[PDB]
Amino acid sequence: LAHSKMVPIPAGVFTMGTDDPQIKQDGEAPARRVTIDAFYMDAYEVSNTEFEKFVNSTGYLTEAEKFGDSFVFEGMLAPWWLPVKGANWRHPEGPDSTILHRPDHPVLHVSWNDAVAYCTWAGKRLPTEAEWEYSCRGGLHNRLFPWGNKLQPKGQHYANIWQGEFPVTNTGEDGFQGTAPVDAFPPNGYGLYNIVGNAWEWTSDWWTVHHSVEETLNPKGPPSGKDRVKKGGSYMCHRSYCYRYRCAARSQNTPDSSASNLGFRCAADRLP
Ligand SMILES: *[C@@H]1O[C@H](CO)[C@@H](O[C@@H]2O[C@H](CO)[C@@H](O)[C@H](O)[C@H]2NC(C)=O)[C@H](O)[C@H]1NC(C)=O
Ligand SMILES: [Ca+2]
Ligand SMILES: [Ca+2]
């Protein structure tokens, strides 16, 4: 395993957002041309084992641990999000769950601040939204998914999302009901795994839904806000109620928030 390996994301110009938004309220539109300097992205979501190295080194106590609760999906114990006492990264469904059998799955119940701590510890940083989206698209222009426009290309599952009737029944057709190992499923064109689905991913940007069509260089998002941007969707997402496993999709949370479907990966200007 090299679950902290990074890949070089090439310098380029891309179309961020879309002129055919699927969730208009989220400011997926307008499409705009964005220039991104060459940089490095983690191939994988940060795993339990990798976060454990951080905690072992630093003694870091996550915000969920200090608060004493975190959000868990009802189906693995909105109305289906319950604040569970004692749910945190070591106990993803609450006090009597464990990570011992899933060391290579993405770390969960990490806040934005927790993610910034990790990435900086590791000689890295969070990606910007624009860097994240560019990387997600994996060298393809104006496609829905990292791999193209078909959800199951060649009849194959390419990401860990939901199959079945949400929230009652997750069939586990794609091989995983909950999270999957961070190295599951095919890589995209840049060598990134689970950039859509599995765990949601924090980015560095403050959230806004108001974007200009002006061309920008290495944009950082708005200078202020109350919520940070997360991307990519999760194992919970289904077309029937969600549809956020598209590179253009975007959602938000307050920086002290944590949940059983939200993780992160890091980026860096140069190799640490
Ligand atoms: C985090 O630290 C713990 C405690 O030191 C590590 O677990 C120990 O590792 C040693 C060395 O392999 C073993 O001999 C012990 O049996 C382990 N102790 C316990 C209580 O489990 C753990 O491996 C570290 N985590 C990571 C990801 O490196
Ligand atoms: Ca699944
Ligand atoms: Ca993911």
How many CB atoms are closer than 10 A to CB 173? 13
What's the gap in Å between 37 CA and the centre of ligand 3? 23
Backbone angles phi, psi at 9, to 5 degrees: -90, 120
User: What order do you get walking across the sheet with 262-263 strand by strand?
Assistant: 251-253, 228-231, 200-206, 262-263
Residue 231 to residue 251: CA distance in whole angstroms = 6
Amino acid identity at 45: E
Other CB atoms within a 10 A radius of the CB of residue 185 amount to 24
Q: Which of 52, 57, 99, 100 to mutate to test the pocket of ligand 1 (most atoms within 8 A of CB)?
A: 52
Collect all residues with Cβ–Cβ distance below 8 Å to 207 and sequence separation of at least 6.
Answer: 221, 225, 226, 227, 228, 229, 250, 252
Q: Which two tokens stand for residue 193?
A: 């795994």
Question: Residues before each break in the chain (C–N > 2.5 Å)?
Answer: 77
Distance CA(182)–CA(194), nearest Å, equals: 7
* Type of residue found at 182: V
CATH number for the domain including 154?
3.90.1580.10
Q: Please choose, from the candidates 263, 270, 254, 216, the residue with its C-alpha nearest in 3D space to the C-alpha of residue 118.
A: 263
Separation CA 51–CA 263 (nearest Å): 11
Retrieve residue 24's tokens: 């208009």
- CB of 52 within 6 A of ligand 1: the answer is yes
Q: Are 249 and 231 in contact (CB under 8 A)?
A: yes
Shortest-distance Cα residue to atom 26 of ligand 1 = 53
Q: Say how far apart CA 141 and CA 15 lie, in whole Å.
A: 7
> What backbone torsions phi and psi does residue 255 show, to the nearest 5 degrees?
-60, -20
* Ligand 1 and 25: CB distance under 6 A: no
Ligand 1 atom nearest to CA at 52: 27
Return d(Cα 148, Cα 129) in angstroms, integer.
20
CA 34 to centroid of ligand 3, rounded, Å: 22
Q: Report how many domains make up the chain.
A: 1
Structural domain boundaries enclosing 153 = 1-272
Closest by CA to 181, choosing from 33, 39, 46, is 46
3-state DSSP helix/strand/coil percent for the chain, to nearest 5?
15, 20, 60
By CB atoms closer than 10 A (0-12, 13-18, 19+), residue 247 is buried
Contact 153, 161 (CB under 8 A): no
Three-class DSSP category at 119: helix
- What ligand 1 atom has the least distance to the C-alpha of 49? 27
For the chain, the residue count is 272
List the one residue out of 241, 256, 252, 18 whose CA is nearest residue 129.
252
Cα dist from 100 to 96, 152, 163, 205, whole Å: 12, 31, 26, 33
Phi-psi region of 243 (alpha: psi -120 to 50; beta: other; left: phi over 0): left
DSSP-based three-state secondary structure for 139: coil
